[PDB]
Structure formats: structure tokens, C-alpha cells
Amino acid sequence: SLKQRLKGKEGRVRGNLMGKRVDFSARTVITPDPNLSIDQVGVPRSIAANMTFAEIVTPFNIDRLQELVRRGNSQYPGAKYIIRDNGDRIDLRFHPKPSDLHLQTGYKVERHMCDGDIVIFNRQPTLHKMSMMGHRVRILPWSTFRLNLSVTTPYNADFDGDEMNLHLPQSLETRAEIQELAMVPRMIVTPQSNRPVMGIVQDTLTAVRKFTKRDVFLERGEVMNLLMFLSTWDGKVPQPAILKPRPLWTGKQIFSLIIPGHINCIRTHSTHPDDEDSGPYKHISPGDTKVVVENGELIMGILCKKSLGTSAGSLVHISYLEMGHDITRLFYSNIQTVINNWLLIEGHTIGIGDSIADSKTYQDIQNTIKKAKQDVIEVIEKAHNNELEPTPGNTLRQTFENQVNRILNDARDKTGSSAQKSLSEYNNFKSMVVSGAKGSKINISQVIAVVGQQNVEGKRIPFGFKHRTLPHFIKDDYGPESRGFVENSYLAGLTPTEFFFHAMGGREGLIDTAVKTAETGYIQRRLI
Amino acid sequence: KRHIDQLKEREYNNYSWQDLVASGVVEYIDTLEEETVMLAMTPDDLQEKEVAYCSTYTHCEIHPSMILGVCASIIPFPDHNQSPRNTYQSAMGKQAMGVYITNFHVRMDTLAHVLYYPQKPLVTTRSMEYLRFRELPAGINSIVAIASYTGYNQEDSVIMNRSAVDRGFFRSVFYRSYKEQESKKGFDQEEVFEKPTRETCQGMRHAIYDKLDDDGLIAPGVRVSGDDVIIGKTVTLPTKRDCSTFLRTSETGIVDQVMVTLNQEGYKFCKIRVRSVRIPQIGDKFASRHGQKGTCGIQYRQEDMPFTCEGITPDIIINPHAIPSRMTIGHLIECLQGKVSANKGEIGDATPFNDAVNVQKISNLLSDYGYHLRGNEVLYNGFTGRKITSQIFIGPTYYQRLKHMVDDKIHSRARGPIQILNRQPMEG
């Protein structure tokens, strides 16, 4: 009916007027490109050949445009159409049209998209305005859009099959509006939380943490190679930190050349002892924690997500607020390039040896689990003998569940702490967690020590069968194993019942995500 | 022992599962009966006398690993992975490229992908034998280094060896089949397969009609680029209208088979199959058997890839940052077990709940073959030759090529076709 034509999503009002399918748009898969700048995007030649930008023929660009017209649609840097003053569109694709190849001022040459064009880049859903940003085109081989990795976080994009939409402005006026209101360097700091939207991420973050340790010393050739990838370099090699016996620069000394202008910042590393600030060695910091950037020089410290990440007061945020957006763009790009080449030198990996802990650590974890299981047995015996008394506001069932959960969680935390004590400096799980690039201490603990309690709907694994969780367990068993506690780590491998309970927990998480999307989308539409 | 010995001689002993059921050894139990039955996961661990948990077991599981399905049964060491990752691997293994059937040549199916050189996994679950994964495998074992090399493996992407790709690694064939039926609707209006004529047929296109044979159907073995005319069909106009089928844009294939038959109605019916050989590009999607996928970030040649002392260069480099948050430790255990199996010559056992295959035992086995216990290896940087300071985890892991390829997804629009009702750009 006429009402159905106009009514809902896919109706005229919403599906054709508020939003609509548009021309000069391209969608393809995205792949990483560390070498591209923040604002630069990588465009395949085919996509750039199909999409066009009309350029008015002027006396100063008539020669270049006539060359482009001569090349035509076939040769890539060419023109698909020529729009006359009357509005007649001569077609350069179909037949030479030798008389109509002539250009005069006022004609519009629909040239192919070239390097330096401004294009809007979008990922769905566009939750915030940083999801649509203006990028400068660079044409690269192969068929994927290629974007800098610092720009992945605003788009919420990972290169695992994601695709990104690309919209090309078709007028100089709208091109300027896009360039000024929406360029990626102008989008660094969000108005939502007055923090930078973008920061150093993934490999660059871990390699920065490793690079800015006190231990890192770079010889002459490595210093020159790294200074090659610093675009803002003044061409002057800093005097090395250690002149004799052999000239050796420091990772901090080279990173000081990355930091632009004269930026002042004080942060603290993630593994900063709380005792250090109160006691002596405030400004010496035995662990090289803390971070002090004076006059744009890294005097002391190890950088992590707290210094180079998306947080208020970070080195990135201070750079944006002090030196401006263009210099901050250069800052991001230089960090990524020189630190990625140093990572080529030092290297990074993850293996089984990271998951393995000391034999003493495993023994301590086992002892903690035994003690916890015995304490849960004791609590169950107290409840069975009716010694247990209800906590105020809770039933006897609820207070028993809370006590058992507390015991199990405390044991899980103690095993996790033992596993984390076991971690060496060389451990790479610890490297990624300390840098903040990926992972958490919870993940390390589950990998090495104990997967933990599997809980569905905020309670231990329910009695799905008649008064028992699985047919293998006896009826009325409230012990840790029966109700879902997984004592084995991922490296050790879950036992079959633990495997099923873990599957129950993961299923709950997946259901939560899938149900969440739609409700949040409705709320967002209503607010807007 | 009598039953097991008779089943071991199964053929030429006429003893089968039904005889096992008839003897009363095994029994079928449904969920309602599962509610009233005491089960033991394993006979030795549970039935045998110990600190008595239960002394009234009425049944025993044949093997715990059977709780998994067909797609989850291919996952090696599934108990060492996070639970959502096994769901992801089930979904992705439904999308892997392999030899789907042996009669694929006879079948003319639209959108058929078949891999050049499928391989059976070096680390395999026993239940795979009953899934026929050895007979019709999907994926290739590949030397994989878990390293941060040039930043092109960051996020979830994967660096690949271009030389290996050039040697047949993950090369596939995509068959697209087109069907066209000549039919008569009006008594004077009929559709005929013929090579369209510029003058005789009113509707025509720039697309070359020369490749069409006399019957109006392209012969097999002819290269057909995008928008060329596969089938030439003309309709009498009560001079003629061109209803000829064209290739899907950017198909760029070679005709494989052209079959001409009569359908149920008796009208002439033609099926034409086009081969497009797809080599891995830097947009294609590859996934391990542990629920972590990724597009090819870049391809480096064998000279550029990091190399071990033995001269081995990884076929695939995956970012280490994938492992920690996902906690897919089964991936690392599979790499270690694959290294051990490849040096030993056996096929590794990754059944979910073996309890006889620890990680420490695999490490001790790998030590005997001259490698580091934990599978790390001193890698030399390909570009400069200098040893990489951090020793890098290398091993043979099984990887699958998912059907999602960049060539099918790349699209661009510029003043193209427009819908009739909305007069807005079309969809798709």
C-alpha cells in the first residue's frame, strides 16, 4: 500500500531520502600499510580509474588537462569524460572523437582520481564522527585499501576481512569543506572525551616500550638507518650518549629526535612502583619508570599506552594541543616508521615458552587450588550441618553461593599472581601486557595458571540436568569442579567437563554481543 | 577383550557395531535417560577404585571428544583454546577451499572453488578419519613464523612468501557456471541460440560477439574477458532483441565445459562453465584451524623473508599480537607438534582430551631432533642478514584459504545504472 511505501526502513522517507545510494563510491577490503602517513590512504588503480573528478579547464591547467584527455580512459592517468559548456558530455572511452578532443576554458575534464585527492573514508557502523574521515589519496598496486595503523582505532577496524567505503567529493567547494572539517590530522582529539582518538598501537607500541628501555644502545649504522626514516630530521646526528669506549646512542636519545618542537610532559609507566614517588629515588626511579619529556627531549622513562596511547595528557595529546595537528601527524608517522625498523632489528614473537612457567610456580598453583577446594568442602559441610547463618539481605542459598564464589575467586587471583611473578623480563606475553599493545594480566593468568570460574547469568554453571550440572557428577554437588570451576590452564588443557562449562561461558558472551548490537543501535538512532 | 578383538578383525569376521549393541555392551541413551544415569568419562580414571566419588556408575562415555560436531572435530587441541575461538573455527572451516567432491568435473555448479594442492594436516584429530578429512582435505600445511616483521602483519593481517605462492601455495580455481534456456512464450515469439548480427538484431552491445560459435555458444578453451558474450540468444520481435548472456564483470576466465541438453519442457538448455585461476593476492583471507583469520598484508619474496640457519623461510608470518588476547594456545601447541611430526615422520595426535600428550612431552621430543624445546629459532633478517635479537617461534601449522577474496569484493561506482522507481543508483 501507499503507507507501506513510505512507512519504515526501506521506505521513501528513511530508505530513499534520509539515506540513499550514491555515486562516486568504492568499497573494498582493507590491509595494513605502515609506510603510509595518517592522512594518506592507499587506493587500487582500478578503483581510481573508475572514479572521476571533474576539473574546470582554466588557462593555467589547460595543457595538463589536454594531455590527460589525449591519454583517455584506457591509459590510467587520463580522463573519462569531457563536459562542454553546453553540458554535452563528450565520451573519451568510446572512439577517438578527434574533433571533440579540444579543450577550452570552461570545459570540465572528468579526470581520473590521482595522488593527492581528498576522499572520505567510512566504516560501518558510523558510531561517531571519527568513523568518517578525510584521507589524501595514494595509488598503490593490488586491490585493497591501505591505511595507517594509528587510524584503525577510530574506525574500529582490523585487517581480518573488514571493508571500508570511500566517497569522493565532486566539487572544489565540497573538497575544501571535507579537507578542513574532516581531515584525519584534524580529527586526532575527540570532543567526546577530550582525549586523542588515535595513538600508537599493535607492534609499534611494544617496540616503543622495548626501544625506550635503558638497555637499548644503538651503534652508528643502526642510528643512521633509523634517522633515514625520520622525515622531520634536521640532518644533524646527535652526539652519542656513550662516546667511549665505542660510540653508542640510546633508544631514548633517538626518540628524542622524534618528539617535535619543545613539548613538556610527565607520565608514569604501567609498572611504576607506588613506593618510588613517596620514598627516595623519586627522580632516579630504579626501574626507569616514570616519563619526563623536557624541551621535546625524553630525559627519562619507558613509553607505553599511558604515554603514547589514547589518553588525556599523553605525549600525543600534548603534541596536538601545543604544536598543532600537522606536526602531530608527522609525529605519529615518524614514530611508526623508525620504531618499526628498529623492530625489524630487535624482533618480537610469541611462543609456547611464554606460556610455560617454573616448576615451583606450577606447584604453588596446585597447592593453592587444593587449599581452595578443601575450603569450599568445609563451607559445604558447614551448610549441610546447618552451622551456616544467612548474611543480611541474603538467603542461606545466596550467602553460601557468595562464600563459595569468594573462596574460588581468591584462589584464582592468587594463582594468577603466582603465574605473573613467574614471568621473566624476556617473556613476551608480559611484554605485550606491559606495553598495553594487547592482552591483559587476566589473559596471562588464564594462559599460565587457571582459567577460572565459568559463570552463566551471573551464577555458577546451573543444574541443567535434574539437580546436577552434567550426568557425570553426582546429584547435589556444590563443589568447585561440579559447578564450573576450571583449575587447568589453557596451556595445560581443559578436562572434558571443564571444556563444556567453558563453552557455556563463551556462548553467553557471544549471545550478549549479538543481542547488544540492536538495542544500542535503536538507542543511538533515538538520541540523534 | 573378546569384543574389541572381534571388532579389530571387523572385515572377514562379520562383527560390527550392531553385534556390539546386540551383545548388550553398548546402549543408546537419550536426554531423559541421561538425567537418570551415572556416567564416567573414562573407565580407568573413574571406574577404578580410588577415593570413592561414586561407586554406582551405570555407563561410561566411549570417548569425550565425541561431544564435538563435524566442523569442531577438525580443530586440533580444542581444549587449549578459548571457547569463542572454536566457534569461529567452525564457521571458518565451513568456508575453507578444498576439493569439495571428487566428481567436481562432472558437476556444473555455480561458484565452485577447488584448491590446487590440498594437504592433510600434520597435526590431526582421530575423529577426522570419520569426517573423511584425509580423503578430501581443505587447506595446506605451511611454515608459519609468529613474528612482527615489517608491520604488514599488524592487527590481524598476515605476511606471505611470494616465492611459495609462485610455487603453487594456496592457488585455487573458481568455476562459475551460467545457465540459459531458449524458450517460446508467444506463438510467434521465440528465443533462439545464435550469434547476434549487428544489422539483423536490433539490440547489440560493444561487447565482442566474435567468440560465439555458429550455434551461439562459446566453445571450451576460449579466453573470455569481463563483459564478453558467453551465450548468444536472440528473440523474434513481433527486428530481433538481444537477450545474450554476458560474463560477470571482472570474471576474466577461460571456458571449461559447454553442455547442451534438453530440459523437462523439451526446450534447449545450455550450461557453460568458466575457469578463473585465483593466485593468492594481498587481499585474500587465510585462517588457521584455531579461529584466528587474516587478510594477506603483503607478499615478500624468499630473499626478503626471514631465514633460519637451515635456510627455511616462513611461508606465512602472523602477528604475535593475535595470540595473547584470543588465548588460542592450541595454535602454539599445534605448531610445536607439527614441527615434531615433520621431523619425526609421524602424524601428530591432537585429540581433545588425550591426557597422554603434554606440551612438555612434545618439547622433549623436539629437543631430540636438534631444535629448541619450545620451538623458537634464531631468525636472520632477510633484508640485512643480521640475526634477529628475539628468537622467533616457527613451525608447520595448517592454514585454510577462505572463500572471501578481495577480487570479488572490490567495487567502484561513477554515474552508472539507476533504478526506475527511485531514480537513484542501483544496489549491488
Binding site: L408, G452, K459, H502 | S83
Partner: peptide, 8 residues
């Protein structure tokens, strides 16, 4: 999958 206070 961790605990009651964590995640499932």
C-alpha cells in the same frame, strides 16, 4: 569465563 565479577 573467568569469574563472577569479571566476564563469563
Amino acid at each position: 569465563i573467568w569469574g563472577i565479577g569479571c566476564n563469563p
